[PDB]
Design a protein around this ligand. Structure first.
Ligand code: HEM
Ligand code: HEM
Ligand code: HEM
Ligand code: HEM
Lengths: 146, 141, 141, 146
């Protein structure tokens, strides 16, 4: 992901303020409400019939927390996204069968949550560095498909 | 919108397809699977091999839906309603994939119809496939 | 289609935006050009610096068209007819560009609406911008 | 691109049967007719009033031979599409102002023209290698945009 030196600094500063457990449940929760066809992989999760049922479902929340804890690890290895996400790539391909379009959509839902959560501090120039991050993370997660 | 000339070029081109519809469908599915591997995530337990009997079966179901859409060009939404409900509520395939399948069907038709795939015809077909794809995802959300 | 709840959620949000519409239209444009630079190929002889008077003037125009669309949510194609002819016969902007402006208009509103940018309201805005982008390109071919 | 020893060989043997001037004229006119908004850059080319006139327009064919030779030229540097297209990438941004999506549509109309021109010899596997090539050339042409 070529991020400029000025972009990297900004991404890491913002990231130090993120409670990963709470942002992860919110981002996966918004993925399931805004793009409802994404609920196809969660048939054992119970109630996902309304925005409030998706948002408050203990299973959605627990899953969001594990998904974003792994994503947080990528931000710590920005020059090696493909190797840090290789195992997870082989897992979403061979065992869970997830179309990688799914990662690009969550990535973009993430950008909106960060903007919401942080307000004015999520400036045009910070957005562009996050957009570089989200695309690199999604390219890395799709890398071992075949 | 599809126009009178579009609807004319489509019927004439799909009409030439005829009884090969099934065969064309499976090739389009194979062209997809090979050129864009991410589409395979939707057929996890299919036997995806060259000549697979399962792929042949599914291409025939696909070609047949397109036949019904051609025969109801004037009202595809009513025509494809069991089909959009099934894609929106069960299958739940992501919208980026229908562009990939549409391209592969045009490539298959270009390779089988030398004389019928003229410039204006290719253009009407691209428009009808996009129209079929919008109807299939129209109940997604 | 936009549900009764979609319509209700968009008007509530856009009303909260109120008099800052033009500024948010200018901010979404700047978010657009720094994030997805290929979009600048459409404004080659424009001054795009931060605070430029050409970006400010275009933000306003953009935001007025959306307010208009918000007032005629049940009649969009008619409402936006002159702009759909303008984009289709003169400007001719590639359709993939409209997802980029729509995404940057949701980030802009989320950055300014702490309480109104709920998950049900986010959903609604995303369906609405997509429908205004489908009207704008509806006459391209 | 990403091509295997076997993809490289399928592509090069097919190209060897192409008349650059005719396929280039053929693919650019198809571009101009399937996606008419692409006409925005060539309003000085005269008559573009019907598919027949666009296809027959001598300037349409001149331009087409010109773009298909630079593409033809690029097939000799499959392991480095990027650097072989940099100077043209800079020129398509800075002097010409052309959105890169136009390169991908051209790439994909060309695959249709190859299928038409060659028939059954343009097999599922050959299409596959050509798909990596056109997406490889569009991506190298979009590379220097800023
Ligand atoms: C930021 C991108 C993503 C990351 C880092 C990530 C990470 C993970 C991780 C670490 C697991 C745990 C697996 C195990 O040991 O069995 C997992 C499972 C899973 N992921 Fe992803 N994920 C991402 C995006 C997505 C998206 C967008 C979807 C679908 C909408 C998805 C669907 C699933 C499913 C269905 C499982 C298995 C869940 C279960 O055990 O019930 N992931 N993911
Ligand atoms: C022009 C576009 C399409 C048409 C006409 C179409 C048509 C159909 C039809 C007729 C069925 C059978 C339903 C039944 O058994 O009742 C079906 C099922 C299915 N479709 Fe779609 N489809 C299209 C696009 C797609 C795309 C793009 C994908 C994914 C890349 C897809 C994935 C599936 C799957 C996985 C099934 C169920 C197959 C099985 O597991 O047996 N479809 N489709
Ligand atoms: C929600 C989507 C959009 C809306 C509501 C919209 C609306 C407008 C409006 C109101 C105008 C001004 C017409 C006038 O001069 O009176 C305009 C012009 C223009 N638009 Fe669009 N537009 C949208 C998307 C886009 C996109 C995605 C692009 C390309 C990146 C684009 C490129 C242009 C250009 C180049 C002009 C002419 C600029 C000038 O000379 O002032 N538009 N649009
Ligand atoms: C993707 C493959 C393409 C390649 C390899 C290519 C290559 C070239 C070359 C070699 C030139 C001449 C440059 C010079 O020496 O001045 C040129 C000019 C040009 N290209 Fe491209 N091109 C491609 C696609 C496109 C497309 C799809 C468009 C627009 C739809 C486009 C728009 C133009 C224009 C407007 C010119 C200038 C023409 C003139 O001066 O009359 N190019 N391109």
């Amino acid at each position: 992901v070529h991020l400029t030196p000025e972009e990297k600094s900004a991404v890491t500063a913002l990231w130090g303020k993120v409670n990963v457990d709470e942002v992860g449940g919110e981002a996966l929760g918004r993925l399931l409400v805004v793009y409802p066809w994404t609920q196809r992989f969660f048939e054992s999760f119970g109630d996902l019939s309304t925005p409030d049922a998706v948002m408050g479902n203990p299973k959605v929340k627990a899953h969001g927390k594990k998904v974003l804890g792994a994503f947080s690890d990528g931000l710590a290895h920005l020059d090696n996204l493909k190797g840090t996400f290789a195992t997870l790539s082989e897992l979403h391909c061979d065992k869970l069968h997830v179309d990688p379009e799914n990662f690009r959509l969550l990535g973009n839902v993430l950008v909106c949550v960060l903007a919401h959560h942080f307000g004015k501090e999520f400036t045009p120039p910070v957005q562009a560095a996050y957009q570089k991050v989200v695309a690199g993370v999604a390219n890395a997660l799709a890398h071992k498909y075949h | 919108v599809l126009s009178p000339a579009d609807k004319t070029n489509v019927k004439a081109a799909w009409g030439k397809v005829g009884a090969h519809a099934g065969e064309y469908g499976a090739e389009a599915l194979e062209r997809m699977f090979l050129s864009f591997p991410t589409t395979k995530t939707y057929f996890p337990h299919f036997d995806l091999s060259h000549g697979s009997a399962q792929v042949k079966g599914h291409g025939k179901k696909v070609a047949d839906a397109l036949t019904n859409a051609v025969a109801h060009v004037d009202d595809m939404p009513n025509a494809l309603s069991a089909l959009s409900d099934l894609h929106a509520h069960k299958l739940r395939v992501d919208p980026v994939n229908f562009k990939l399948l549409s391209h592969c069907l045009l490539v298959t038709l270009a390779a089988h119809l030398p004389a019928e795939f003229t410039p204006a015809v290719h253009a009407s077909l691209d428009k009808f496939l996009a129209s079929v794809s919008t109807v299939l995802t129209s109940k997604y959300r």
